[PDB]
Amino acid sequence: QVPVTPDVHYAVEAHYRAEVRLLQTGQYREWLHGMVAEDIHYWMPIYEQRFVRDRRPDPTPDDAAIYNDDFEELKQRVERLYSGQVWMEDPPSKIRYFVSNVEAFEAENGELDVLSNILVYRNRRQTEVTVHTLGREDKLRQDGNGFKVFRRKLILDARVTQDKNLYFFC
Amino acid sequence: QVPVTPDVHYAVEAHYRAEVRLLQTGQYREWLHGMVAEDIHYWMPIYEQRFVRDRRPDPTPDDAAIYNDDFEELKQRVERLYSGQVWMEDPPSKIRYFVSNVEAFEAENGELDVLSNILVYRNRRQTEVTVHTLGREDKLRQDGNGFKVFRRKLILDARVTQDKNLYFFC
Amino acid sequence: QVPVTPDVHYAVEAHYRAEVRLLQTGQYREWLHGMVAEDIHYWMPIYEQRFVRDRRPDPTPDDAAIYNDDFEELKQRVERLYSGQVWMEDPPSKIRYFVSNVEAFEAENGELDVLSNILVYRNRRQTEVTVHTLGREDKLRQDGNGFKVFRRKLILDARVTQDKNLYFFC
Amino acid sequence: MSGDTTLVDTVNASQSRQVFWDRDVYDLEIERIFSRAWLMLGHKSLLPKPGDFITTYMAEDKIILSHQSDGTFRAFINSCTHRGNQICHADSGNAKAFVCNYHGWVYGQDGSLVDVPLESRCYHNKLDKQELAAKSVRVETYKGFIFGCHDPEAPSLEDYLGEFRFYLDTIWEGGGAGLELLGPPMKSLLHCNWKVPVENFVGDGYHVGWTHAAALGQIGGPLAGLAGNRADDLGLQFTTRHGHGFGVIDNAAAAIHRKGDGWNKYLEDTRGEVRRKFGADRERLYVGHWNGAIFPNCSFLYGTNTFKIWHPRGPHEIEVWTYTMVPSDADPATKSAIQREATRTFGTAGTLESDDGENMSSATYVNRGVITRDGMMNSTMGVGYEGPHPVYPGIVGISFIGETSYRGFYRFWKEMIDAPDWASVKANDDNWDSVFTNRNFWNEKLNA
Amino acid sequence: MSGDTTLVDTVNASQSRQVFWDRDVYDLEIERIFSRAWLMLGHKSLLPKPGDFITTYMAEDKIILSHQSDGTFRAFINSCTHRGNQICHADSGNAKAFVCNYHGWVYGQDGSLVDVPLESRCYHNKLDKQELAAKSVRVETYKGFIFGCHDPEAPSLEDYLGEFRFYLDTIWEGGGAGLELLGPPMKSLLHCNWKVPVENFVGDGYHVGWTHAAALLGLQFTTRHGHGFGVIDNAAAAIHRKGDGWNKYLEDTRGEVRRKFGADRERLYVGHWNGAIFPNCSFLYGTNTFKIWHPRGPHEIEVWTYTMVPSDADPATKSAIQREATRTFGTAGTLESDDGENMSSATYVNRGVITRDGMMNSTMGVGYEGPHPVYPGIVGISFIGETSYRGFYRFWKEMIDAPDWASVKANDDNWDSVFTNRNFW
Amino acid sequence: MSGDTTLVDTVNASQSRQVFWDRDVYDLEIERIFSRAWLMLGHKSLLPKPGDFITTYMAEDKIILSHQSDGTFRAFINSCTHRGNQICHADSGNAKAFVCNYHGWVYGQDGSLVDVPLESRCYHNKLDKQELAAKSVRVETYKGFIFGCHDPEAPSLEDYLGEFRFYLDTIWEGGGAGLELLGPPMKSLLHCNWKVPVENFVGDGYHVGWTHAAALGQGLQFTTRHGHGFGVIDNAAAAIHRKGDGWNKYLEDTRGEVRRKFGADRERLYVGHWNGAIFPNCSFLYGTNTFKIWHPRGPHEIEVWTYTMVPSDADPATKSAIQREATRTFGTAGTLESDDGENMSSATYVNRGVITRDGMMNSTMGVGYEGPHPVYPGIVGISFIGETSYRGFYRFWKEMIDAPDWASVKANDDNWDSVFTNRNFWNEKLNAA
Numbered sequence A, B, C: 001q002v003p004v005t006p007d008v009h010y011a012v013e014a015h016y017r018a019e020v021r022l023l024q025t026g027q028y029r030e031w032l033h034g035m036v037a038e039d040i041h042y043w044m045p046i047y048e049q050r051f052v053r054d055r056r057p058d059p060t061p062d063d064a065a066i067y068n069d070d071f072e073e074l075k076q077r078v079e080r081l082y083s084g085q086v087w088m089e090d091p092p093s094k095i096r097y098f099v100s101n102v103e104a105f106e107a108e109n110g111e112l113d114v115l116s117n118i119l120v121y122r123n124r125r126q127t128e129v130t131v132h133t134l135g136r137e138d139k140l141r142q143d144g145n146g147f148k149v150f151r152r153k154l155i156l157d158a159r160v161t162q163d164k165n166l167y168f169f170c
Numbered sequence D: 001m002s003g004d005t006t007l008v009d010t011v012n013a014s015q016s017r018q019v020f021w022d023r024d025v026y027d028l029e030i031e032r033i034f035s036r037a038w039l040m041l042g043h044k045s046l047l048p049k050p051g052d053f054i055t056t057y058m059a060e061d062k063i064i065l066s067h068q069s070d071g072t073f074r075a076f077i078n079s080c081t082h083r084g085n086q087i088c089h090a091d092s093g094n095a096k097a098f099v100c101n102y103h104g105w106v107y108g109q110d111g112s113l114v115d116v117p118l119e120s121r122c123y124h125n126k127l128d129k130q131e132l133a134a135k136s137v138r139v140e141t142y143k144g145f146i147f148g149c150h151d152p153e154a155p156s157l158e159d160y161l162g163e164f165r166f167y168l169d170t171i172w173e174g175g176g177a178g179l180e181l182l183g184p185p186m187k188s189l190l191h192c193n194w195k196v197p198v199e200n201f202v203g204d205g206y207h208v209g210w211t212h213a214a215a216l217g218q219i220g221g222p223l224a225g226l227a228g229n230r231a232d233d234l235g236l237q238f239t240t241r242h243g244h245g246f247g248v249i250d251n252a253a254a255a256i257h258r259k260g261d262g263w264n265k266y267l268e269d270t271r272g273e274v275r276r277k278f279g280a281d282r283e284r285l286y287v288g289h290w291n292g293a294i295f296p297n298c299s300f301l302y303g304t305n306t307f308k309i310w311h312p313r314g315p316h317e318i319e320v321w322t323y324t325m326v327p328s329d330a331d332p333a334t335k336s337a338i339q340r341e342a343t344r345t346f347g348t349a350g351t352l353e354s355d356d357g358e359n360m361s362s363a364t365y366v367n368r369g370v371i372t373r374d375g376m377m378n379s380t381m382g383v384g385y386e387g388p389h390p391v392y393p394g395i396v397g398i399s400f401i402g403e404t405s406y407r408g409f410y411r412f413w414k415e416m417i418d419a420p421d422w423a424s425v426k427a428n429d430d431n432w433d434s435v436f437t438n439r440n441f442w443n444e445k446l447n448a
Numbered sequence E: 001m002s003g004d005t006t007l008v009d010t011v012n013a014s015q016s017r018q019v020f021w022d023r024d025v026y027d028l029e030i031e032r033i034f035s036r037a038w039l040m041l042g043h044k045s046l047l048p049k050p051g052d053f054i055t056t057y058m059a060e061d062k063i064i065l066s067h068q069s070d071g072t073f074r075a076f077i078n079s080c081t082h083r084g085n086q087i088c089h090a091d092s093g094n095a096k097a098f099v100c101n102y103h104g105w106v107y108g109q110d111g112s113l114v115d116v117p118l119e120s121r122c123y124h125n126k127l128d129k130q131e132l133a134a135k136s137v138r139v140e141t142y143k144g145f146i147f148g149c150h151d152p153e154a155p156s157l158e159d160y161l162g163e164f165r166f167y168l169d170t171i172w173e174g175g176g177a178g179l180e181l182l183g184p185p186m187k188s189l190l191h192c193n194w195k196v197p198v199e200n201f202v203g204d205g206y207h208v209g210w211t212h213a214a215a216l217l218g219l220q221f222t223t224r225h226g227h228g229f230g231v232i233d234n235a236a237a238a239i240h241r242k243g244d245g246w247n248k249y250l251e252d253t254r255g256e257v258r259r260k261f262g263a264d265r266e267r268l269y270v271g272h273w274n275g276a277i278f279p280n281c282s283f284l285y286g287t288n289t290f291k292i293w294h295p296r297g298p299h300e301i302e303v304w305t306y307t308m309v310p311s312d313a314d315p316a317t318k319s320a321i322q323r324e325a326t327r328t329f330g331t332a333g334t335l336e337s338d339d340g341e342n343m344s345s346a347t348y349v350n351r352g353v354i355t356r357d358g359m360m361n362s363t364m365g366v367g368y369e370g371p372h373p374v375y376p377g378i379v380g381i382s383f384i385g386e387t388s389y390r391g392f393y394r395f396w397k398e399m400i401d402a403p404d405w406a407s408v409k410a411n412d413d414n415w416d417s418v419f420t421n422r423n424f425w
Numbered sequence F: 001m002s003g004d005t006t007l008v009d010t011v012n013a014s015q016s017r018q019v020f021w022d023r024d025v026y027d028l029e030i031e032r033i034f035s036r037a038w039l040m041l042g043h044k045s046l047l048p049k050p051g052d053f054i055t056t057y058m059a060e061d062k063i064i065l066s067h068q069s070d071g072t073f074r075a076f077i078n079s080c081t082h083r084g085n086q087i088c089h090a091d092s093g094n095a096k097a098f099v100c101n102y103h104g105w106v107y108g109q110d111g112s113l114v115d116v117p118l119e120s121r122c123y124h125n126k127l128d129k130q131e132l133a134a135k136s137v138r139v140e141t142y143k144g145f146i147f148g149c150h151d152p153e154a155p156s157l158e159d160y161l162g163e164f165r166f167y168l169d170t171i172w173e174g175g176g177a178g179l180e181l182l183g184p185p186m187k188s189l190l191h192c193n194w195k196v197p198v199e200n201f202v203g204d205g206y207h208v209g210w211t212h213a214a215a216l217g218q219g220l221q222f223t224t225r226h227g228h229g230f231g232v233i234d235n236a237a238a239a240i241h242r243k244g245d246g247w248n249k250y251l252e253d254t255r256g257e258v259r260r261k262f263g264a265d266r267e268r269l270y271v272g273h274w275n276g277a278i279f280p281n282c283s284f285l286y287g288t289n290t291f292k293i294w295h296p297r298g299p300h301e302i303e304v305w306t307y308t309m310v311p312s313d314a315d316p317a318t319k320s321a322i323q324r325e326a327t328r329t330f331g332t333a334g335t336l337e338s339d340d341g342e343n344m345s346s347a348t349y350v351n352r353g354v355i356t357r358d359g360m361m362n363s364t365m366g367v368g369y370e371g372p373h374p375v376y377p378g379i380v381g382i383s384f385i386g387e388t389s390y391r392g393f394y395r396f397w398k399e400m401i402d403a404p405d406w407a408s409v410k411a412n413d414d415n416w417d418s419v420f421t422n423r424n425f426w427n428e429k430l431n432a433a
């Protein structure tokens, strides 16, 4: 695939930084409506530990996944956070994302295929801290002013999740 | 607010990289005199865990903070490290900063408001390792082909600090 | 030393992102032959905890190091992973690299001296997770169009490694 | 260790905070529960063909579970009898043999030692492989679900389920080809005692309207009536001799399924056969939403169709595995749809399950303080509003909201903890429910 | 486990390394010190209006501390009596009720179980709420400072402070409206035994000149209930800088202290104190940091750091004292950051059994101390010495040896006998 | 436990899983092995000049090891006798004194408390410093290697090595100026019981062809009265060096002298590849030349320090080459070492489950194909691949665990090898043959 120009690469990183800011500040409605396309597939597959010899195909959207959502399903996930009855988020927790290795490639009709590494640090209550690392494989389309994501696949590094939940967006 | 142009963004990131290098190499005097404005307010407020229904204002510079310094006070913090009587720093420790999500915006009089995420990895002695994540909110002004910070607000992610101290600059 | 132009900096960071992608996806052959020069010195010195008063020089390539390799020795290290008898890698582990603070400088003869911070997150089996932070000091040369590393020095932050091994490339 | 522990009070329906905290209690549990009871390993569906296998836990022990050539299932301890190295690191696969990669000892599908490198040359054919099998575990199956047990003195799996089979037949056999499990499982660690989530699923209808107020709001439907725990009987609670229990919300099986219609169609299409095979009183259950557990540590929601096993990791931690239940004869899109809906609500990023994590962990870690820990936990809700029922076996509590199933769970916990062996448990088979003193409860209820 | 432990040698003045390390000893401290004594909770200034509350610790137990409608203060264990869920996760606020968010049981400001969802329809009004209050904790206050105690047989707070009140009245009541606390507190974890920081603040003037070489004429005191401090004369700043509100405050009020408490207490009012209230509250008077060291087992603590300020000081003066106290003794303190390794290292060396087999010395200035004609308790000459260590460990050992408060009180009249130089003063 | 533990079956040749897992077992090893045996501290070459020191561990205890003015070596507990602070935080360096940075107490190169700040003003010269020295550790050396011991009733270091000296002499004294250690050491944590890597090095030729299969695709066994053992692959010392060259040559130029000094049957071993261990927790490969000490951190973790062995009279380029090759194969990123990590950790942690833990581990390979040898002292097993050295390791492990003091161990000096019942094994073999 053809790497994007440095100017488009700039634009994609700036998009991802804005996305991170919205999500770190609980602006989830602004993120969903402004940065996620109505035809989104938001997907976090379950990968099992298989021997190299195992010839089975990798997970598809038809198979087990932690997230496997369209727009309305993401909206429900987002809207639940605006209830004042999410006890675990009162007082609120903290999240901080470190996005690196953004590589963007030209697709058709001005769409882009984009890869990134993500490191997620989560803090809550008094001494709770959890950390996650993932890869992210996005398809983006331009939404002057900006981008919207319409395919997002999230690849977790840990087989057993060391956190009470994975209830955060990437 | 208006994001800076790609060229100014580059310049800000380069400045932050150089800042990190100085701080990682014990060039604290160089950092302070080269990169910090004399009108600096360097501030790391204490944020308590409050219910959302709590209508009290966020901390001000009049309130509790782990750092709440002007230039002379920072200078004293720096000069302590040059005393040769810093036993915890003999042998010296290691520190490594991962800065990401640099977002710079146009303020007035050609100043910049700049947001960034920081992950700080500290190592000392044989097996000691501590990790901190913070939001940084700066105001920078130009300085003869670089910048100087004149307001620095550091927002720690953890309510209870899991380290012997927070004696490092950001 | 003189910092590279913004356009050269972009090129060096693009190179590093591609290198990370090869190393994350098990393309070790592709990395070695496409991104490492035949005259490589790949070096990870062992640093001891020494008093400030200590006058001994820092380690040289003649002294202890975890890695102290030329091209052929790296190739051996790479080729071992293709043997199909690395039991620890069946099923395979995960690795993800967070590279930041890339600063490149004009050297002699069109070569580049490049500094960077690396955070390496490793996961394997069910619940194993290990993390390393290092400084990296490279000499790169043009390999039109792209780069090859001909000197690579890796500076580990921790005196006692909290991992079963250091068997990953940087 | 007294023979009549005060850790659980079955007269006043309360349990000591020590049960969520104390290490000595936990070690006794490992000995008198986890090393004695039948534990959930999975389902034939997870290893459906000869040679298929999965790795799983039984409490803190790793096992390999393998579909034999003859079509039977066997399990053994996942540790080499040479120097003890874990034999198999894959989650699943197909294998005729399992190789220890330290020195290359080879185990067959039943844990027998079949080959050692250099047996002739270096062992001088003097090693007798017959005595060196990896430790076997008893495996029995019920409607395709596979359980394991370490105690040769345990009753059969079918007798251990006992009168709970009345209920499980309703759903696991059902009106079609029966339920099965779909993996791969989610796995996560949670800083809680294993009993906090188990008691939550076995018996805790009360929390749903409070804890899951926000999620119920987004979902709508029948279950939203529960939100806020406000003065608006819904259903029933059940408990049995070996601690198994559940609560049921009438007519609500598919209530969380937003999209969701293949599963509801499946129920409507098969309920007539449940009435034929199992009666109208079990048809009622077939279309209801259950939260249940199979003692000690398997929990499930029937309807929502999440299925969990809570593996202890010491008194203050667990590792929970989450599968989906689906009808084996449901169409591919219905199976995938059930899986999406169960995972969105009760997976690791569950819209309901995410609310539960602090409830579980907090109720555990509060007891780090000695003053906090010196106290009892209450499970008296609805005591006396339950008893033996003329149609439903076991003990039945009126209403969906109550603590009948907590009472039955902890009554059996105490019985196991006090019993030096299975014989001692069996000795009290007839009187297990004497602590449920309202014997006339249902005679009055059903003719009022 | 005897009524005469060899872990502390009071003859002699040394202590076994095991007191910093052994789990069994820790568990005994929890029983015989933390479950027995009055522990520092905070100050009225932290919850000054009806309904205001804070969450805090008493050793390893979490409590809610609440300003009642009638101006009294009550505390209760922060754990629901249904399935044990922590009730309140806010650091502070104002609340007429505390709701457990697992099933929604509602606790009053005194921990009474006031309401339960569906009490009528679902519990059938058979739940006896009177029996299910969150466990109360006895609360007493002294000069606005709020203490808590678990033992119904303990002396009053004022008797537990006892003769230390002579010293506390000087600074806590003082010459104006008295001292109060300013939060929110810093909180951090430190891998040390709780006694290392405490012995450091109670009695350790010796390290100051070595440990705190950068940045840059007294007595020591100990009492019956372990409370102690060292004072450096004329130094109640001396990190605040001459003309500021704090300085002006001491000058405008020391006349009152001389009138109210005499000239011998005017001397201490303008001195710099490093002190401890037994077991685990420490403070610097002058610098005005105030710390409570919550144990987290034998090898870790969580320390909470507040500022002491006069209640009638103007806002700028309160803020200024806060900024100087935090810059020197906060989590990034220019002095406090130097002490971290001293604390942790004196703890973790004891990981090895050979190392752990030994005694630690606190003999400095033995015999240069005794009872005093003006100052109550035991008073050691000079600021640098280990008088306060000796009084601290003596009472540590008495408490560990005694099965109950009665057996402590039995030895009231003979407490200072280990200070043999009776005519030193 | 008792005086005759069932944790090890010497008959039978099996050990209870509990020995990799149980805390009570570990604590008793701390009392009766680590607090009683001679433990490897390093080599004179690591601190070659007066005032030179290193910091190191004896099991969980931190020590300072100092080259004294008089050219002898002392060691002492790296903890201050005021409030217990660790005194020295440097890996290595030169010092005429060790200052505790809490209050400033000053310690001599032998651990004596030589000075305290304000001794006169504040202490009123009433402090008895001679009573306050940092706790000394017995130090003895053998062929430049430095050992420490906590037990005053313990035998001499050379008695402790005893008959294993016959073999160590071959390599440590050798045909040149002898071997020494090259640092700084690599250090890492590994989540295993300390006995898994020790038994692997002492006796495990068997795993090499399986575990280290990837890397490879590129003799005899000995045990002794005090647990020490090794396996040897004839004519193989450099086999795992990628380059020749300096080492290969060093052997040839020095072998003749080994033959003269030590005999042709020690020369056979001088040119063999050894995997060996010095009881309890020092291991090494002769040939490859890695040198490891496995410091326990409780029953389920170690910290391993890895040095390089080099001829002390080799030239800088040869020492460098051996270091590179020894590190590339057995360092923290070792092309062979990296393969062993899961073997070690897994064998320990499977025993977290009580059902798994209830079992014995088998070390019977070659039982009976071993016994007293004509030439070679101790017990000798035929072939490089077998488990003779495991058997001798665990026999002495059991002997130490049963014994309440060194006297009780010395009581059994003449009886130690009874368990190897094939007394006439080697005669029969050599007469055949």
Ligand code: FES
Binding pocket: D080, D081, D082, D083, D084, D085, D100, D101, D102, D103, D104, D105
């Ligand atoms: S441990 Fe399994 S073959 Fe040796």
Ligand code: FES
Binding pocket: E080, E081, E082, E083, E084, E085, E100, E101, E102, E103, E104, E105
């Ligand atoms: S645990 Fe508090 S209301 Fe149930």
Ligand code: FES
Binding pocket: F080, F081, F082, F083, F084, F085, F100, F101, F102, F103, F104, F105
């Ligand atoms: S602890 Fe070493 S001098 Fe005080």
Ligand SMILES: [Fe+3]
Binding pocket: D207, D208, D211, D212, D352, D353, D356
């Ligand atoms: Fe729930």
Ligand SMILES: [Fe+3]
Binding pocket: E207, E208, E211, E212, E335, E336, E339
């Ligand atoms: Fe200090």
Ligand SMILES: [Fe+3]
Binding pocket: F207, F208, F211, F212, F336, F337, F340
């Ligand atoms: Fe090996």
